Design a protein around this ligand. Structure first.
Ligand SMILES: CC(=O)N[C@H]1[C@H]([C@H](O)[C@H](O)CO)O[C@@](O[C@@H]2[C@@H](O)[C@H](O)O[C@H](CO)[C@@H]2O)(C(=O)O)C[C@@H]1O
Ligand SMILES: CC(=O)N[C@H]1[C@H]([C@H](O)[C@H](O)CO)O[C@@](O[C@@H]2[C@@H](O)[C@H](O)O[C@H](CO)[C@@H]2O)(C(=O)O)C[C@@H]1O
Ligand SMILES: CC(=O)N[C@H]1[C@H]([C@H](O)[C@H](O)CO)O[C@@](O)(C(=O)O)C[C@@H]1O
Lengths: 264, 271, 272, 272, 267
């Protein structure tokens, strides 16, 4: 796409506001354990590594329809994004394991944190890479994973790619952003691991993330579609007996877009 | 609100100074355990999750009356106070340098008492109207009925473990809205600025700063600060600095007060 | 209160003050053992019998420094005041914490290192043109300080002092006497002082410390005005707790370090 | 050594190189199980019998990339060289660490999560116009590498190599062969290479990782000159250890992740 | 003392100095085993019998470098900036040494871990030291090569300005009782950090892309008196934990690339 000048004047700007609910594994808002995974299980061996249905976090994603419009395209300029419900983690009276010989607080949601978001003018492009090439996803046929397994996928094998085109279906554990593509998407992510690690989270309505690239051009929304993707794991809830479930939080987005003239 | 020009000259600026005491659960300044929660308890099961009265931190909030500007409210333009900036600090951080209280102690009862430690949660908001809240909870079934002074939704549903926009409120009462189930609504709060952080874990070291030298700008991207509707300035916060661990392992939230110095200027608006 | 006018320019319009303050951890006599540490920490049996032993309570370090006298003529329109512009401040003796051979508890079944000084860190300093203004606030309103009557504490106790009760205030006017645990900077005053503090808590937390002679802290406020030294007095306060020393039997003592200050001041005309 | 003149302008004066490098943790064959991990870690009985097993030691990843061929000769007054201006680099597959169902040790009496990959992190990359220059330095001068004759290590051992002995140098000229544990970037050379590295140690330390496609790292030095590609070769090197996988019985293996690079280069006139 | 005038411009007005300093953790002989480590740490039975063994005490590394000879005015070399790095960080990626190990003797060997102490100084004269110790009674007589004060006093657990020195000898001034004197060192820049605790993860960086500016607030760098450049450092990266729980400090070398320029001063 050859990018030309900005379209100026009234109605040259628009904003899109949305939220995405977490996809930790139990993704149905009407059912038990919503916003958590099912109980985590552990493989007996690497050749019998078959996660139960609903114990695997997936990416959240949506395509948003923009106002219908050389051609003109919507250009994403900036985004204000926040994790919602951080204060919900200030809760140590739930039915959990507890400190100091059953006299102390319940364990707060704690441990692994994974936070990412992406804003682009087309689906986020994915690279397959896994800690175990033999992982068997057949307990849940709604998960999108490659049809074949190979040893090489514990590293970067460029023959194993995808696009994030379905909410609550692409496991985070085996799909990551493809850094060799995504020219029309901006993504940002972080991971803090360990077993019981303190979550460290911020929330504010005052921070704007600029989406323009080094040439001053933001994602250009092909077919008037804006693509938003994320995942926000804030830790594990530790049940009385030591059973553990991922806990995720929703993410809010306020995206500013402007009209851009392009060739063709 | 259509915003017009700043009013210039003498008396076009004013400052508001206040503090808010913490609302950790024992919120009566004449009683023992003020500025702490009651002892934390743990639910027998998620269907019988009924916190005891006073064990739940709530937001601190106040509405401050500003100097009246408009004699006639029906005139063509009005003047409003616009919050430009705030200097805010947590008070009494040094109070956490105390390891001789009646607490669990280190090294086979020969070492220090456990300092207040663990979960930290720090947030403040300054706006021209009440902070707008979104309901979201770790347990949709939580039963708040041991304390009918707590403001919570009148019905519960599974969906509130995520973001369900049908469950909203406004922070209109001090010491009443639980932090654990209410957060700032990011889809609103156009006229409020809020800032918050959480550091979790069990025994985590608190990491705290205090200074009188930092100014937080409240002007938005268009150079407009919160506009104080009906000459009311709204200030909200929560500052949990950890748990006090009693001899037997019983634990209580500890909170600290927060100080605010807010600078405001006169702004002409269309009426 | 003070209407600030223009800077005085030219020779002798600038001066610098250099000092250090030794730590006041509880054993504050430089001729005795355990100097720069507290006495052994003790733990209350209950909150109504919370009576710290003499010398187990850290206090603020403070000093007033006399500046060159300026105004002989008090009848003119204007006076001159010293204005603190900036300070270079450092914790001294950080390297002293590189010591794991002292008589302490030790790692790995009595074969490993002695425990280094570790745990709670508390670091604050203040530079102002009058005494640091204090607010009382305590973790335990019933704390009984009467084992050491040299501590400056309020004469009455009340439940409300576990929060901010503005009836309980003081000024930091004595070195080694105001407990850190119950006095903090009063944020509703101190217009003429700049203070900076941090706390890192927990039980055995690694101290994280920096020392350099290359960092200048600007004391000017948002209007470009530094602390103005009333009666030609410069007030410097601090506290620097770097952790606990853990004795063989588990007995623990606060350890503090000295702080150095190099303060630059300039002449400022004010309205009289 | 190289006198740098003006930029060459006009068509074909810019070029970009894009690649990835797979990790070399020890099992470096992409057709075998445990690819991108080390073999099980073993521990020497004593420092004079410290002989790591074949495949348990991480090595640097490296490649030399051919750039569009330029004219080299002794007789011209000036030549053109490729100058590396900037690089976008990222660790790939960070999300793969969101996995606690692998056959591992587990939390809370066999009812909790599997241990995630955790512990030691080591992250470094280099971009230069010639091989990364290495300095030998080891925690144990007697380490015996003879279980794997494909490793490049010095032919003689000496006590002094537990410090900096400048007689022990090399160049990173082979992928998956130079152990991280005994080779580091030589800071006394590498004038024509930019390298960046970090280490976070400890036993079970949480990995702290970031990934984004929005960060450009400028390779120009303080004089505005990037690495100059001798013999039209661009050299890219890295190592990204993200922790250990802890097997059921406590057996542990290094885990590494691939790194992506997008390097921008421009034609530079130099004196010949 | 020194009135600083203008920079000398033109050819040969700049020079660079490059060196490294090997660590002085206690076993400071490069021909012997345990080089770049301390001897085994021992622990006093009481504070009045606190006598570290010979070789268990880290000391500062230091060197004086001779600059090109120059000389009403004189010319001095002015240190403008330094690129400095800890060398051999990657050496800490080693968990197969003869050490204590994780998970019931099946896991990794403990990496070097715990206390970190990192400092460097660049100046135009010896680094000026202040004595300060955690234990005034520490007895250094097991190693008479250590430079320590000849008398002990209670006051030295704080700042006693009567106890000073200059860092004039490599591998001799213990870190545990000497620190930079902040009341002097007008002609030296120093930078230091300490991360304590028992088993703390070391957190270390290495790059050849970071320049530290040595100019002060007035735009003046250290001025090299008698054409001498003084470089000092200490870089402790943790402890090696032996099979039996015996522990030794581990240190790493530091590299320096210092840029200097000619400065006219009043004579
Ligand atoms: C770093 C090192 O020297 N590793 C040794 C290794 C260790 O000494 C041992 O594994 C402790 O972790 O021992 C190796 O040889 C072993 C024999 O010494 C043992 O008696 O028999 C084993 C057979 O199951 C084993 O082969 C090893 O683990 O492979 C050799 C290695 O250099
Ligand atoms: C820091 C200190 O004072 N170190 C002592 C050391 C310690 O008291 C002890 O090793 C605890 O780690 O003791 C030294 O002398 C030892 C004798 O006290 C012991 O009875 O026998 C030991 C056998 O080697 C040894 O002689 C020491 O370990 O060298 C002396 C040292 O200054
Ligand atoms: C990753 C994996 O293979 N998980 C499997 C688990 C675990 O091996 C054990 O529960 C120990 O957690 O066992 C199952 O019978 C189960 O719980 O449904 C099958 C499941 O596929």
């Amino acid at each position: 796409i050859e990018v030309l000048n900005l379209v100026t004047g009234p109605d040259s700007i628009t904003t899109i506001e949305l939220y995405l609910n977490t996809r930790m594994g139990q993704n149905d808002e009407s059912k038990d354990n919503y916003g958590y995974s099912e109980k985590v299980t552990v493989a007996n061996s690497s050749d019998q590594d078959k996660p139960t249905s609903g114990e695997i976090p997936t990416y959240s994603t949506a395509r948003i329809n923009l106002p219908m419009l050389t051609l003109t395209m919507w250009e994403a300029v900036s985004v204000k994004t926040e994790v919602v419900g951080v204060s919900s983690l200030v809760n140590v009276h739930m039915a959990t394991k507890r400190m100091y010989d059953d006299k102390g607080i319940g364990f707060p949601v704690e441990g692994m944190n994974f936070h990412m978001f992406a804003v682009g003018g087309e689906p986020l492009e994915l690279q397959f890479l896994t800690g175990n090439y033999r992982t068997d996803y057949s307990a849940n046929d709604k998960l999108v994973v490659p049809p074949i397994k190979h040893q090489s996928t514990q590293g970067l094998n460029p023959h194993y790619k995808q696009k994030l085109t379905k909410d609550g279906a692409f496991p985070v554990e085996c799909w990551c952003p493809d850094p060799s593509k995504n020219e029309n998407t901006r993504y940002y992510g972080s991971y803090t691991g360990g077993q019981s690690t303190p979550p460290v989270l911020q929330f504010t309505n005052t921070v704007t993330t600029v989406l323009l690239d080094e040439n001053g051009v933001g994602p250009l929304c092909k077919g008037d579609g804006l693509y938003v993707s994320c995942c926000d794991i804030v830790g594990f809830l530790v049940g009385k007996d030591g059973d553990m479930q991922y806990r995720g939080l929703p993410r809010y987005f306020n995206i500013l877009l402007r009209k851009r003239t392009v060739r063709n």
